[PDB]
Amino acid sequence: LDGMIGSSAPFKNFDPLGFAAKADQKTLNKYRESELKHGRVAMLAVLGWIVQEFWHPLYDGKLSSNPLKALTEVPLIGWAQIFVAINVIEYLQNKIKELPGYRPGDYLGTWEWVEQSDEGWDSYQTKELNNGRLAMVAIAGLIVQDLITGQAALEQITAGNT
Amino acid sequence: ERSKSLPFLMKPKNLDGSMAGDVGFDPLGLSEINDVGVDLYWLREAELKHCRLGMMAAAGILFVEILGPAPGFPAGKSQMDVFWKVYAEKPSLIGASLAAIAILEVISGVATTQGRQNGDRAPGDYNFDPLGFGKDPAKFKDLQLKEVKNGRLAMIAAAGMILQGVSTHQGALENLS
Amino acid sequence: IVAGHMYKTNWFLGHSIKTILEAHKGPFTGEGHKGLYEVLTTSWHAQLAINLALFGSLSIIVAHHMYAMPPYPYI
Amino acid sequence: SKAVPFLEAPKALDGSLPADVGFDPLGLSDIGFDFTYLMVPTKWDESRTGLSALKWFREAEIKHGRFAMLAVLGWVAVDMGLRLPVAKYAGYNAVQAHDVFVKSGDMTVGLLAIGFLEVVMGAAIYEMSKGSDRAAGEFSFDPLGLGKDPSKYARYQVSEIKNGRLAMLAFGGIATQAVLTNSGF
Amino acid sequence: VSFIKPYRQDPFVGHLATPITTSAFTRAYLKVLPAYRPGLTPLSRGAEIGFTHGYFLIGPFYTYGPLRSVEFSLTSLAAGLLAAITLLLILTVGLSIYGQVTYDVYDNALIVKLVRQMVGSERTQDLPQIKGTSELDTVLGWQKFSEGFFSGGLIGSIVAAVGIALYSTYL
Ligand code: CLA
Ligand code: CLA
Ligand SMILES: C/C(C=C=C1C(C)(C)C[C@H](O)C[C@@]1(C)O)=C/C=C/C(C)=C/C=C/C=C(C)/C=C/C=C(/C=C/[C@@]12O[C@]1(C)C[C@@H](O)CC2(C)C)CO
Ligand SMILES: CC(/C=C/C=C(C)/C=C/[C@@]12O[C@]1(C)C[C@@H](O)CC2(C)C)=C\C=C\C=C(C)\C=C\C=C(C)\C=C\[C@@]12O[C@]1(C)C[C@@H](O)CC2(C)C
Numbered sequence: 001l002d003g004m005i006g007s008s009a010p011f012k013n014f015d016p017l018g019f020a021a022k023a024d025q026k027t028l029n030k031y032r033e034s035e036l037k038h039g040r041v042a043m044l045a046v047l048g049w050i051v052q053e054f055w056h057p058l059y060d061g062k063l064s065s066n067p068l069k070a071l072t073e074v075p076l077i078g079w080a081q082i083f084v085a086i087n088v089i090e091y092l093q094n095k096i097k098e099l100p101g102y103r104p105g106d107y108l109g110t111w112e113w114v115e116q117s118d119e120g121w122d123s124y125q126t127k128e129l130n131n132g133r134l135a136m137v138a139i140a141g142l143i144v145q146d147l148i149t150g151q152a153a154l155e156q157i158t159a160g161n162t
Numbered sequence: 163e164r165s166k167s168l169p170f171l172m173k174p175k176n177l178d179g180s181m182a183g184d185v186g187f188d189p190l191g192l193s194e195i196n197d198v199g200v201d202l203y204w205l206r207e208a209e210l211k212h213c214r215l216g217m218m219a220a221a222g223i224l225f226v227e228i229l230g231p232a233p234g235f236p237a238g239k240s241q242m243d244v245f246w247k248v249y250a251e252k253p254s255l256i257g258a259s260l261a262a263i264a265i266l267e268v269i270s271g272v273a274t275t276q277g278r279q280n281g282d283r284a285p286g287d288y289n290f291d292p293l294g295f296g297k298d299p300a301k302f303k304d305l306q307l308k309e310v311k312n313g314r315l316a317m318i319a320a321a322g323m324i325l326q327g328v329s330t331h332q333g334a335l336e337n338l339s
Numbered sequence: 340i341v342a343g344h345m346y347k348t349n350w351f352l353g354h355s356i357k358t359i360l361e362a363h364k365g366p367f368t369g370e371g372h373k374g375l376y377e378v379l380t381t382s383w384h385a386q387l388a389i390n391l392a393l394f395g396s397l398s399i400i401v402a403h404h405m406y407a408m409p410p411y412p413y414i
Numbered sequence: 415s416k417a418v419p420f421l422e423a424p425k426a427l428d429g430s431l432p433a434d435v436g437f438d439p440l441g442l443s444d445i446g447f448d449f450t451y452l453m454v455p456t457k458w459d460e461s462r463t464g465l466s467a468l469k470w471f472r473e474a475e476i477k478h479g480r481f482a483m484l485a486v487l488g489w490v491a492v493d494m495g496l497r498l499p500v501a502k503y504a505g506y507n508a509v510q511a512h513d514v515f516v517k518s519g520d521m522t523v524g525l526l527a528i529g530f531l532e533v534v535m536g537a538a539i540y541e542m543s544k545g546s547d548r549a550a551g552e553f554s555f556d557p558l559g560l561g562k563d564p565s566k567y568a569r570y571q572v573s574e575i576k577n578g579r580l581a582m583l584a585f586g587g588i589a590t591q592a593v594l595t596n597s598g599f
Numbered sequence: 600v601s602f603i604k605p606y607r608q609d610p611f612v613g614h615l616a617t618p619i620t621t622s623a624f625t626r627a628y629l630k631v632l633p634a635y636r637p638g639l640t641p642l643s644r645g646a647e648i649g650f651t652h653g654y655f656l657i658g659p660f661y662t663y664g665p666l667r668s669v670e671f672s673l674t675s676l677a678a679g680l681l682a683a684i685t686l687l688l689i690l691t692v693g694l695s696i697y698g699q700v701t702y703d704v705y706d707n708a709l710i711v712k713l714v715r716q717m718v719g720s721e722r723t724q725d726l727p728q729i730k731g732t733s734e735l736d737t738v739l740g741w742q743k744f745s746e747g748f749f750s751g752g753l754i755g756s757i758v759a760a761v762g763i764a765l766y767s768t769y770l
C-alpha cells in the first residue's frame with residue numbers, strides 16, 4: 001500500500017483491511033519478506049505436489065503418489081537433512097539481511113547493480129509476487145482438498161470429484 | 163470516383179477506361195499488383211489467353227457433343243473421358259499438340275515480357291488478323307469488347323464443363339437434360 | 340511452406356530480422372542482439388561459420404537417425 | 415441516454431448513427447481494436463487511418479439483421495410447404511433439410527456464392543476503413559428506387575435495423591423452439 | 600537494468616561484478632566460511648577447516664577403498680580412517696612447506712604501515728611489499744593454521760568414523 005513493487009491492474013495497492021496504512025517502514029519490510037517467502041515456498045510446494053503425483057522416481061518407486069501420505073513415508077532421516085538445509089539457507093538469509101542497503105525480499109543483492117530501477121525490473125518483481133500469491137492460494141486449496149476428499153490433484157480431477 | 167460496376171467501391175486506380183470490358187470490377191484491387199513480374203499488362207494478357215482458350219474449349223465440347231466426333235475418332239459424349247480414349251489409340255497426336263502448344267506458349271511468354279518492357283505491343287496482341295476483320299478503328303474497339311465478353315462467358319462455361327465431366331462423368335448437354 | 344511466410348520481403352507483411360534481434364536484450368546481456376543483423380549481412384565468413392557448424396551437426400544427426408530407423412528397403 | 419437511464423452513455427453513441435437510442439450497458443462500442451484487421455491483418459496501406467469499432471459493429475448489425483430476416487422468411491416458408499420446382503427437395507422440414515442438402519453438394523455451392531458476395535462487400539468494408547465516404551451497410555442497392563426522399567431513407571433505415579433486431583431474436587426463438595406456431599418440437 | 604558491471608568501478612581489472620562474484624548471497628556465504636569468518640584466530644580457522652575436511656575425507660576412502668565391505672566391517676572403517684589421517688598428514692606437510700617458503704612476517708597489518716611511514720630502504724619483500732594484511736599471511740599465523748588443520752583433521756576423521764559406525768550399526 002505504498003510505492004512498493006507488487007501493485008497490479010486488478011486491485012492496485014490491495015490493502016482492503018488497512019494492514020499497511022498504519023504500519024511503519026520496518027513492519028512493511030517484514031510483511032514483504034513474509035509474502036515473498038510464502039510465495040516462493042508455495043510455488044515450490046505446488047510444483048512438487050503435481051510432479052510427485054505423476055512422477056516419483058526416487059525411493060525406488062513406493063512413497064505413495066498422494067501427498068500428505070508420502071509426508072509420513074520419507075525415512076525421517078531424509079526429513080532431518082531437508083530441515084537442516086532449509087535452516088542453513090535461512091541462517092545465510094539472516095546474515096544477508098544485515099548487509100548494507102538490504103531490501104526486504106532481495107537475497108541476490110540486486111540493489112548493488114539496480115540503482116534507479118526500470119519498469120521492466122519492477123514488472124518482473126511484480127510477476128514473481130503475483131505468481132507467488134497464486135501459488136499460495138493454489139497450495140492452500142490443494143492441501144484442503146486432499147484433506148477433505150482424500151484424493152490428490154490429478155486424481156480428483158481425473159475421476160471428476162469437482 | 164466510384165467504380166461503375168460496384169457503386170459501393172472506389173474506382174480502381176489502374177483501370178481508367180482503356181481496356182475493353184472495363185467496368186471497374188476489381189474489388190480486391192488485383193490490378194495494383196506490381197510484383198513477381200505481375201502487373202496490369204500481365205494480368206490482361208493472362209485474361210485474354212484465358213478468354214481465347216475457354217472459347218476454343220467450349221466450342222470444341224459443344225461441337226463434338228452436338229455434331230459428333232470426326233471420322234476415325236472415338237465417341238462417348240463425355241469430353242473429359244474421351245480424351246483418354248484418344249490418347250489410348252493416338253498418343254502421337256496428343257504429344258505433337260502438346261509440343262506445339264509448349265513452343266507457342268514459350269513464344270507467347272517471350273512476346274509478353276518484351277512488349278511489357280519496350281512498350282509497343284498491347285496485351286494479348288499477336289498481329290493475327292489474316293482475314294482483316296479488324297483493320298479499321300471504331301470497329302476494333304467493338305470487336306475487342308465482343309471478344310472479351312464472349313471469352314469471359316466461355317471461361318465460366320469451360321470451367322463448368324470441366325467440373326461436370328470430372329464429377330458426373332457425363333456429357334454437358336447430358337447434364338443439361 | 341508455412342514457415343516461409345515469416346520475413347518481410349516486398350509487402351507490408353512479415354517480420355524484419357533486424358527488429359526481432361534488436362528487441363532481444365536483457366539485464367545480463369546489455370545491448371543483446373543489436374548489430375548481429377549487420378554482422379550476418381556484411382560478412383560471408385559469419386554465415387559460413389553458422390551454416391557449416393549447423394550443417395555438420397545435421398550430418399551427424401542424419402547419421403544417427405539413419406541406422407536408428409532404417410529408411411530404405413533391405414538396407 | 416434514452417434507454418437504461420441510470421447509465422449516461424457508452425462514449426461513442428452520440429447519435430450520428432441511425433436507430434440510436436443509447437442502449438449499450440456493457441460499453442462494447444468503445445473497444446479500440448479496429449476489426450478491419452480481422453480481414454486485412456496488417457495495415458497494408460499507409461492511408462489506412464482505421465475504422466472505429468462502432469462502425470464495424472453497425473455494419474455487422476445491419477448484415478445480421480438482413481441475414482435473419484431472409485432466414486426467418488425461408489424457415490417459415492419451408493414449414494408451410496413451398497418447395498422449389500425441382501426434384502430432390504421433397505419435404506424434409508427445416509431442422510433436417512440443412513444436413514441432407516449439405517450432403518447433396520448444393521449447400522457447398524451456396525457457401526461459395528455467398529462467400530463471393532461477402533468477399534466483394536468486405537472489400538467495400540475495407541475501403542471504408544481506408545477512408546471512403548461509404549457508410550456502414552450502404553451498398554447503394556436501390557433498384558426499384560424507393561430510397562429517395564431523404565426522410566424516407568432515414569425512416570427506412572431505422573425500420574431496417576429495428577426489423578433486423580426483431581428478426582434476429584425471432585430466428586433465435588424459432589431455431590430454439592424448433593417452431594411452435596407452424597409445426598411441432 | 601544491467602547485472603554485470605566493472606568491479607569496484609575499475610574497468611581495467613581482470614574481474615567483473617557479476618551476480619555471482621558480488622551478490623549478497625555470495626558475500627554472506629563466504630563471510631560465514633572459516634577462511635573468512637570474522638573473529639577467528641588462525642588456529643581456529645585451521646581447526647574448523649581440518650575438522651570439516653577430515654570429516655568428508657574419511658567418506659570416499661572407507662566407501663570405495665581396497666578393503667570395502669557391503670556390510671559394516673571394523674577393518675574397513677579402520678582402513679578408511681588411517682587413509683584419511685595420512686592424507687591429512689600429507690596436506691599438513693604441504694601447508695607447512697608452503698608457509699615456510701611463502702611468508703617472512705610475525706605481525707602483519709603493521710609492517711606495511713611502518714614502511715609506508717618510516718621508509719623501507721632495505722632489501723624489500725619483507726619490510727616493503729607484503730601481499731595481504733590478514734593474520735593468515737604471517738609465518739606465525741600460517742604455522743598455527745597448519746597446526747589447527749592437522750589437529751582438527753584428526754578429530755573430525757575420528758568423529759566421522761564414530762558416526763559411520765553408529766549409522767551402520769544402529770540403523
Ligand atoms: C516445498 C517444496 C517441496 C517439498 C517439501 C517436497 C517434498 C518431497 N518431495 Mg518434492 N518436489 C518439489 C518440491 C518439494 N518437494 C519440486 C518443486 C519438484 C519438481 C522438481 C519436486 C519433485 C519431486 C520428485 C520427482 C520426487 C519428490 C519427492 C518428495 C518427497 C521425498 C523427498 C525427496 O526426495 O524430494 C525430492 C525433491 C526433488 C528431486 C526436487 C527438489 C528441488 C528443490 C525443491 C528446489 C531447490 C531447493 C533449494 C535447496 C532451496 C532453495 C534455494 C533458495 C530459493 C533459497 C517429499 C515428500 C519424491 C517422492 O517420494 O515423491 C512422492 C520424488 O520422487 N519431489
Ligand atoms: C439466409 C438465407 C437463406 C438460406 C441460407 C436458405 C437456405 C435454403 N433454402 Mg431458402 N429461402 C430464403 C432464404 C434462405 N434459404 C428466403 C428468404 C426464401 C423466400 C423467398 C426462401 C425460399 C425457399 C424455398 C421455396 C425453398 C428453399 C430451400 C432452401 C434449401 C435448399 C437450398 C440449398 O441447398 O442451398 C442453395 C444455396 C443457397 C440457398 C445459398 C443462397 C445463394 C444465393 C442464391 C445467392 C444470391 C442471393 C441474392 C442475390 C441476394 C440479393 C442481395 C444483394 C445481392 C442485393 C436451403 C437449406 C428449398 C428446400 O428444399 O428447403 C427445404 C426450397 O424448396 N428456400
Ligand atoms: C517458366 C514457365 C514459362 C516461362 C517463361 C519464359 C520461358 C522464361 C519466358 C518469359 O520471359 C517468362 C515466362 C514466365 O513466361 C512456366 C511454364 C508453365 C507451366 C508450368 C505449364 C503449365 C501447364 C499446365 C496445364 C495447362 C495443364 C492442364 C491440364 C488439363 C487437364 C486436362 C484433363 O483431360 C485430362 C488430361 C484428364 C481428363 O480426365 C480431364 C482433365 C483433367 C480436364 C487441362 O488442359
Ligand atoms: C514435335 C513433333 C511431335 C512430337 C510428338 C510427341 C513428342 C509425341 C510423343 C508420344 O506419342 C509418342 C511418340 C508415344 C507415346 O506413348 C508417348 C507420347 C509422348 C504421347 C512434331 C514436329 C513436327 C515438325 C514439323 C512437321 C515441321 C515442319 C517444318 C517445316 C515444313 C519447315 C519449313 C521451313 O524450314 C523450311 C522448309 C524453310 C525455312 O526457311 C522456313 C520454314 C517454313 C520454317
Ligand SMILES: CC(/C=C/C=C(C)/C=C/[C@@]12O[C@]1(C)C[C@@H](O)CC2(C)C)=C\C=C\C=C(C)\C=C\C=C(C)\C=C\[C@@]12O[C@]1(C)C[C@@H](O)CC2(C)C
Pocket residue numbers: 508509510512513583585586587589590
Ligand atoms: C439467446 C438469444 C437471444 C437472447 C436475447 C436476449 C436475452 C435479449 C434480452 C433483451 O431483449 C430483452 C429481453 C429486453 C431488452 O430491453 C433488454 C435485452 C437484454 C436487450 C438468441 C439465440 C440464438 C440462437 C440461435 C440463433 C441458434 C441457432 C441454431 C441453429 C439455427 C441450428 C441449426 C442447425 O444446423 C444445425 C446447427 C444442426 C442441423 O442438423 C439442424 C439445424 C437446426 C438446421
